[PDB]
Design a protein around this ligand. Sequence first.
Ligand SMILES: *[C@@H]1O[C@H](CO)[C@@H](O)[C@H](O)[C@H]1NC(C)=O
Ligand SMILES: OC[C@H]1O[C@H](O)[C@H](O)[C@@H]1O
Length: 246
Amino acid sequence: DVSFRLSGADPSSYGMFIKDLRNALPHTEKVYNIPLLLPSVSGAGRYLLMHLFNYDGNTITVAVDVTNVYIMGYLALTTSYFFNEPAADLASQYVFRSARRKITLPYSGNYERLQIAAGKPREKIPIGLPALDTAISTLLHYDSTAAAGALLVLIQTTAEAARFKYIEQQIQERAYRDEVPSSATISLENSWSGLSKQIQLAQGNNGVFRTPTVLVDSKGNRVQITNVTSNVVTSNIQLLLNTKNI
Ligand SMILES: *[C@@H]1O[C@H](CO)[C@@H](O)[C@H](O)[C@H]1NC(C)=O
Ligand SMILES: OC[C@H]1O[C@H](O)[C@H](O)[C@@H]1O
């Protein structure tokens, strides 16, 4: 398990959380020195628990699928909550079985359904450490519309930060003042799968991508990534989704 406390949190402590989160995902190889997540894991071993503590010290435990960094669901006091999707339903057979009731959320976990449920896209939702604190607090008590916004925060500040150094740095820059994600951040989130694939297909093709990936950069300019020398590959992405899952 890994843990993060908002009480006394700073850019360093957050960075040590995100490092512990990355280190908790198993891999047996690296591809261009980036950890390759496993094709699958059977049983309870598929799921990492993240223990998150709000500023007053209340906690939720969040289950994460180690093969893709997807949030399956969470436990808040004696109630478990799972996404309305078959991967989470399967995950509920292994984690949080000690909950006194299990609620299935009225949406699946993907960004588009979450944004619908929230009433807004995540371009308009501030992230950062204060927002994470707020998110944890929201999830303590069921409200499905509020929880959608909170989960959008939680996913970006945990899983998305683990996947990309840039996003981790964005959040560190937002330790004491929330701000909506930069459009680069949104672009990386949306491209994780495709980047992961193209980095794996570059092995066998002289480091060249089969199909270029289009990103939005830090200045807001639209840029093509065509090979493993790009900074996104050498100095940013930290975890590759296995092509067996794409
Ligand atoms: C690889 O990408 C770099 C920029 O990251 C670019 O200058 C170069 O032309 C590209 N080479 C190939 C073969 O794609
Ligand atoms: O479509 C968004 C997906 O990527 C993010 O990681 C969320 O967990 C979600 O499953």
